[PDB]
């Protein structure tokens, strides 16, 4: 069985770590919901 349990409130955090780049990628989405790089 699958069950849910609360993990927190949903809020923006002001002192947040910032990281990750901003890639621009050509992708396709197929009927199964898979994205693939083109």
């Amino acid at each position: 069985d699958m069950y849910i349990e609360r993990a927190g409130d949903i809020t923006w955090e002001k002192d947040a770590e910032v990281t990750g780049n901003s890639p621009r990628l050509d992708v396709a989405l197929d009927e199964s919901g898979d994205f693939s790089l083109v």
């Binding site: 849910i4 609360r6 919901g33 994205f35």
Partner: protein, 154 residues
């Protein structure tokens, strides 16, 4: 019980539990990615949540009512992933999204890498609105990950 917030999705298997994903309770509806639950029912305390709407191609499912999350990325502001990884405390990570370019238009995308059971973690705008869920993505050449900001149609 349906109190607004972010939730882990767990499966009780063999002995202990395993976190298979994450979802958002809002306006009495639970929102998660299809690949987390495979569209099957959920327990919430003593109460059963039944699937209401879903789409394998979008990789989304809502429980108890239609998809309620309607806010969208503005296409240029930084966002926060409220990552809820297995075995770890919920935490906020800010990032400037990249873009999935598709034949049908552009999708915001975040280059942040977490375990599979983090799927369904909400991505937020600066008003704290959920602009989509994390976890349907691609693996680029160096092995790192980029997730679409996946949002339903309200």
């Amino acid at each position: 019980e349906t109190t607004d917030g972010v939730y882990r999705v767990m499966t009780r298997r063999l002995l202990g539990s395993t976190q298979v994903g994450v979802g958002v309770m809002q306006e009495g509806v639970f929102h998660t990615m299809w690949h987390v639950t495979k569209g099957a029912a959920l327990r919430s305390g003593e109460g059963r949540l039944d699937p209401y709407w879903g789409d394998v191609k979008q990789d989304l499912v809502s429980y108890c009512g239609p998809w309620k999350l309607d806010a969208a990325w503005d296409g240029l502001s930084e966002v926060q992933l409220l990552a809820v990884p297995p075995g770890e405390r919920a935490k906020n990570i800010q990032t400037l999204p990249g873009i999935f370019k598709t034949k049908d238009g552009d999708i915001g995308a975040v280059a942040l890498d977490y375990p599979a059971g983090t799927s369904g973690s909400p991505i937020l705008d600066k008003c704290g609105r959920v602009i989509g869920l994390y976890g349907n993505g691609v693996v680029i050449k160096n092995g790192s990950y980029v997730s679409a900001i996946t949002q339903g149609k309200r």
